[PDB]
RNA sequence: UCAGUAACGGCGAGUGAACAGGGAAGAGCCCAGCGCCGAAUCCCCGCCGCGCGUCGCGGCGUGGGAAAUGUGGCGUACGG
RNA sequence: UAGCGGCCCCCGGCGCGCCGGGCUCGGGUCUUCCCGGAGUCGGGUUGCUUGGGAAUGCAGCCCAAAGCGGGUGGUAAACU
RNA sequence: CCGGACCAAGGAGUCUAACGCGUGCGCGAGUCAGGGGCUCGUCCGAAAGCCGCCGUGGCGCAAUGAAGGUGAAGGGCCCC
């Protein structure tokens, strides 16, 4: 199918063909609004791979992230109070440029429900994403069984509780010897979990 | 007996007759395919190689391999990732000379 | 695609504007190591007014 | 109970047992074990020598489970079967021998304490050692080695 | 704050503990309710085990536990295939399915095959529809015979005295494993030198 | 339970899990990809036979739209 | 109040029978084919985090893949 | 020297965890079900009873070494 030569071509990033391509879509989004529209994956692949379908109730959405690190908030960056504290120019955000740009197509987008999201582009100030999203009371999407869970109501922003793909990388969840910090199902579950002291009436 | 199983030794364990059975599917992984292998071959035809590809096959072709695979190494990262790289790049300019040859 | 990697295909008829050119990029090339003889058309809703749709690639 | 208890008896006496000159305040020392190497340099010294300082070299995911090799004396090796058995066993004429295996009981090493009775026994173990052997051997019996 | 002898505690109380307590005052109370969930479950499935699916025989790994035999998730592939049973028809059997465990030996193949031969044996298989019967049990054993297990279905649970011979009476137990323990330890290093003294 | 243990720490004060084992519960599955099948697929609007607690079925549509820049059926590592 | 006490109204589920609609196909053995998610993994560096200690996890920037490959095997590295 | 004008009521070594020693009880090289499970809807009873074909486990029964490891029989009387 053509669908593995797209696979196998977007792979070689370093191409003249692909340096060229990135070139002009990276100029092109970079004209645009940091959220915008857009009629169709740039990408219908990595959609597809992402759990996008050619539907009515699938929209696509264009994200532009300043990319950088996490300057602390503070006024004339005065952190008041010991040392190890003192940092304000190399802090960096726990969760990933990508998590962001889901994050701001939900909020902006509160009736759709954030699918996946993949990378399109980037430039030395900015981080290209397109989120796939699904309109949750669209009939082809709750008449269809196989995308009904979106529909129940414990799906509502996926994106602001870390339950999508770029979103649950940060949380350091999985199985085996790396991964005891989330043993419980979260870092604050396992936390909660081995911080409590168990009384038992018999003592 | 002379001989007895043990817990220590090179031959340690408890004795017990090996079941044979065919590997499992998930083993498979990672695997050249025929159409696989002619799919990646076209791509390559259709992009050609990265700058840091061109930069090491010219250091392959004055014959610095040692040069060179200290080159991949700060490109890839990893030392066995670094060597089949080099091993790659050494196949593709020998080819390039058996066809200019022809 | 498949038809020309199956040697099914006797002519292929590629349209010249495609928004995402990586759907199609590879093709001619393909179509030629197989020995199929691929055209380059100008228009992509030409080809879709064959097949009773907006737009088709190939 | 609270009635049996200290309290009860210091109602009245103005200071609650605690002194008139040096009271009880907060913390007069440290908190916890402060001040071991400075101002408690003689209780730390007197009863925990050893407590500071770095002995031996670490061992990263310690699993405590394959160190596992719990052990057997020989004055319990006879306790593992019944008393019918070394009755048995000890009135009959012939050079037959029981067999104790000892892993069925929980014990991986025999180990060497004590004496046996003069009655030959087939024992059983992952490990023997050097005096425990040399016992089994000297009454009749043998050391079988089990994986 | 030491005075005279004692132990070094380090009691772990420097965390704002008092907010994160558990009391178990609703211990007995869960109790009640689990037992009523597994009362309430085993008249669901009236006539199925309430014990859940039948488990294989399973061997601890590692050297503390070896010895000894549990219950394992499911039955393995392979043992369901030996015995000749579709693993998509297992589930509704009552055969739990472990699709993910490997055979390493054969004894252990054989044991929860042969297992699992004694529990089709022992198995009531009624009709889909109860008028119409096919292929499945007779009214002898399906109306009359047949009761709920109690308990799990085939709990799992865990030599002659001779003469000893010279031979073994001969034998170095102790310098065996001394000689042993040296083998494993030296076996590289005295294949290398082998080499390098045929160079 | 392991376990105040392995480990961390001006190796000071202090911090500090996991695997095995016993239990409570127990349940497994689906795509994308590779393929085969005349887009077999879905939304809307009407009409008729229905059914009808406030809405589903069958047909017809010389009715619109989505979808070949890929819907649906088979099939997902336990192989198909 | 006790009682597998009585009477009346309403709302249900699980089983058994009637009609209407949909689907109406499996299992072994042999032969030939097919078989995978990339600015992602991984590497350097920086900052936070962890019991994780020549870097447990997370992220920013730079580099940036492979396919008998890749990840893990709690001390850095090469070979097996 | 400082507090106290007078009266009433309230008002300050407690609870949890961890150790150490002493003492009462039970069993005793063992001991302990505390977590779980079985017994009629369970006033009391959220109690009590039982598990032994739940003793997994904890402490004790073996110490020593940093570790690889190793790991606790004494006597009497005759002969050389």
């Given at each position: 199918?053509?669908?593995?030569?797209?696979?196998?071509?977007?792979?070689?990033?370093?191409?003249?063909?692909?340096?060229?391509?990135?070139?002009?879509?990276?100029?092109?989004?970079?004209?645009?609004?940091?959220?915008?529209?857009?009629?169709?994956?740039?990408?219908?692949?990595?959609?597809?791979?992402?759990?996008?379908?050619?539907?009515?109730?699938?929209?696509?959405?264009?994200?532009?992230?300043?990319?950088?690190?996490?300057?602390?908030?503070?006024?004339?960056?005065?952190?008041?109070?010991?040392?190890?504290?003192?940092?304000?120019?190399?802090?960096?955000?726990?969760?990933?440029?990508?998590?962001?740009?889901?994050?701001?197509?939900?909020?902006?987008?509160?009736?759709?429900?954030?699918?996946?999201?993949?990378?399109?582009?980037?430039?030395?100030?900015?981080?290209?994403?397109?989120?796939?999203?699904?309109?949750?009371?669209?009939?082809?999407?709750?008449?269809?069984?196989?995308?009904?869970?979106?529909?129940?109501?414990?799906?509502?922003?996926?994106?602001?509780?870390?339950?999508?793909?770029?979103?649950?990388?940060?949380?350091?969840?999985?199985?085996?010897?790396?991964?005891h910090?989330?043993?419980?199902?979260?870092?604050?579950?396992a936390w909660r979990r081995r911080n409590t002291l168990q009384l038992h009436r018999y003592r | 007996?002379?001989?007895?199983?043990?817990?220590?030794?090179?031959?340690?364990?408890?004795?017990?007759?090996?079941?044979?059975?065919?590997?499992?599917?998930?083993?498979?992984?990672?695997?050249?395919?025929?159409?696989?292998?002619?799919?990646?071959?076209?791509?390559?035809?259709?992009?050609?190689?990265?700058?840091?590809?061109?930069?090491?096959?010219?250091?392959?072709?004055?014959?610095?391999?040692?040069?060179?695979?200290?080159?991949?190494?700060?490109?890839?990262?990893?030392?066995?990732?670094?060597?089949?790289?080099?091993?790659?790049?050494?196949?593709?300019?020998?080819?390039?000379?058996?066809?200019?040859?022809? | 695609?498949?038809?020309?990697?199956?040697?099914?295909?006797?002519?292929?008829?590629?349209?010249?504007?495609?928004?995402?050119?990586?759907?199609?990029?590879?093709?001619?090339?393909?179509?030629?190591?197989?020995?199929?003889?691929?055209?380059?058309?100008?228009?992509?809703?030409?080809?879709?007014?064959?097949?009773?749709?907006?737009?088709?690639?190939? | 109970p609270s009635?049996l208890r200290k309290t009860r008896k210091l109602?009245?006496?103005?200071s609650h047992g605690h002194g008139?000159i040096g009271k009880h305040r907060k913390h007069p020392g440290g908190r916890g074990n402060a001040g071991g190497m400075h101002h408690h340099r003689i209780n730390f010294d007197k009863y925990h020598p050893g407590y500071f300082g770095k002995v031996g070299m670490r061992h990263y995911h310690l699993k405590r489970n394959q160190s596992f090799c719990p052990t057997?004396?020989?004055?319990?090796?006879?306790?593992?079967?019944?008393?019918?058995?070394?009755?048995?066993?000890?009135?009959?004429?012939?050079?037959?021998?029981?067999?104790?295996?000892?892993?069925?009981?929980?014990?991986?090493?025999?180990?060497?304490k004590?004496?046996?009775?003069?009655?030959?026994?087939?024992?059983?173990?992952?490990?023997?050692?050097?005096?425990?052997?040399?016992?089994?051997?000297?009454?009749?019996?043998?050391?079988?080695?089990?994986? | 704050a030491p005075s005279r002898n004692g132990m070094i505690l380090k009691p772990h109380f420097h965390k704002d503990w008092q907010q994160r307590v558990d009391t178990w005052?609703?211990?007995?109370?869960?109790?009640?309710?689990?037992?009523?969930?597994?009362?309430?479950?085993?008249?669901?499935?009236?006539?199925?085990?309430?014990?859940?699916?039948?488990?294989?025989?399973?061997?601890?790994?590692?050297?503390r536990?070896?010895?000894?035999?549990?219950?394992?998730?499911?039955?393995?592939?392979?043992?369901?295939?030996?015995?000749?049973?579709?693993?998509?028809?297992?589930?509704?059997?009552?055969?739990?399915?472990?699709?993910?465990?490997?055979?390493?030996?054969?004894?252990?193949?054989?044991?929860?095959?042969?297992?699992?031969?004694?529990?089709?044996?022992?198995?009531?298989?009624?009709?889909?529809?109860?008028?119409?019967?096919?292929?499945?049990?007779?009214?002898?054993?399906?109306?009359?015979?047949?009761?709920?297990?109690?308990?799990?279905?085939?709990?799992?649970?865990?030599?002659?005295?001779?003469?000893?011979?010279?031979?073994?009476?001969?034998?170095?137990?102790?310098?065996?494993?001394?000689?042993?323990?040296?083998?494993?330890?030296?076996?590289?290093?005295?294949?290398?030198?082998?080499?390098?003294?045929?160079?």
């Open positions: 199918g053509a669908y593995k030569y797209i696979q196998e071509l977007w792979r070689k990033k370093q191409s003249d063909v692909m340096r060229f391509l990135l070139r002009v879509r990276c100029w092109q989004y970079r004209q645009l609004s940091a959220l915008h529209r857009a009629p169709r994956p740039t990408r219908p692949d990595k959609a597809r791979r992402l759990g996008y379908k050619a539907k009515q109730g699938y929209v696509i959405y264009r994200i532009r992230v300043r990319r950088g690190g996490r300057k602390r908030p503070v006024p004339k960056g005065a952190t008041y109070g010991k040392p190890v504290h003192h940092g304000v120019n190399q802090l960096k955000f726990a969760r990933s440029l990508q998590s962001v740009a889901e994050e701001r197509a939900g909020r902006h987008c509160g009736a759709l429900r954030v699918l996946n999201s993949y990378w399109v582009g980037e430039d030395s100030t900015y981080k290209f994403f397109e989120v796939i999203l699904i309109d949750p009371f669209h009939k082809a999407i709750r008449r269809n069984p196989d995308t009904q869970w979106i529909t129940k109501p414990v799906h509502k922003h996926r994106e602001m509780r870390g339950l999508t793909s770029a979103g649950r990388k940060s949380r350091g969840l999985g199985k085996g010897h790396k991964f910090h989330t043993i419980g199902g979260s870092r604050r579950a | 007996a002379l001989r007895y199983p043990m817990a220590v030794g090179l031959n340690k364990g408890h004795k017990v007759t090996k079941n044979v059975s065919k590997p499992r599917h998930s083993r498979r992984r990672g695997r050249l395919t025929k159409h696989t292998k002619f799919v990646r071959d076209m791509i390559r035809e259709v992009c050609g190689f990265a700058p840091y590809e061109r930069r090491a096959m010219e250091l392959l072709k004055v014959s610095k391999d040692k040069r060179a695979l200290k080159f991949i190494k700060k490109r890839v990262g990893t030392h066995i990732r670094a060597k089949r790289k080099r091993e790659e790049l050494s196949n593709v300019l020998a080819a390039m000379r058996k066809a200019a040859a022809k | 695609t498949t038809l020309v990697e199956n040697k099914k295909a006797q002519l292929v008829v590629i349209a010249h504007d495609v928004d995402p050119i990586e759907l199609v990029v590879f093709l001619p090339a393909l179509c030629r190591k197989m020995g199929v003889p691929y055209c380059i058309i100008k228009g992509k809703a030409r080809l879709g007014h064959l097949v009773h749709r907006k737009t088709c690639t190939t | 009635r109602r009245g006496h103005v008139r057997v004396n020989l004055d319990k090796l006879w306790t593992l079967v019944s008393e019918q058995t070394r009755v048995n066993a000890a009135k009959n004429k012939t050079g037959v021998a029981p067999i104790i295996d000892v892993v069925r009981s929980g014990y991986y090493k025999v180990l060497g004590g004496k046996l009775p003069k009655q030959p026994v087939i024992v059983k173990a992952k490990f023997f050692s050097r005096r425990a052997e040399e016992k089994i051997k000297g009454v009749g019996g043998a050391c079988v080695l089990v994986a | 005052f609703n211990q007995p109370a869960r109790k009640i309710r689990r037992r009523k969930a597994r009362q309430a479950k085993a008249r669901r499935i009236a006539p199925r085990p309430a014990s859940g699916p039948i488990r294989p025989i399973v061997r601890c790994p590692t050297v536990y070896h010895t000894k035999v549990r219950a394992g998730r499911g039955f393995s592939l392979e043992e369901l295939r030996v015995a000749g049973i579709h693993k998509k028809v297992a589930r509704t059997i009552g055969i739990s399915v472990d699709p993910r465990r490997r055979n390493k030996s054969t004894e252990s193949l054989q044991a929860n095959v042969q297992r699992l031969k004694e529990y089709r044996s022992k198995l009531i298989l009624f009709p889909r529809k109860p008028s119409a019967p096919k292929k499945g049990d007779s009214s002898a054993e399906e109306l009359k015979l047949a009761t709920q297990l109690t308990g799990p279905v085939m709990p799992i649970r865990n030599e002659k005295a001779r003469v000893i011979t010279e031979e073994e009476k001969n034998f170095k137990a102790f310098a065996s494993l001394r000689m042993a323990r040296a083998n494993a330890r030296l076996f590289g290093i005295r294949a290398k030198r082998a080499k390098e003294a045929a160079e």
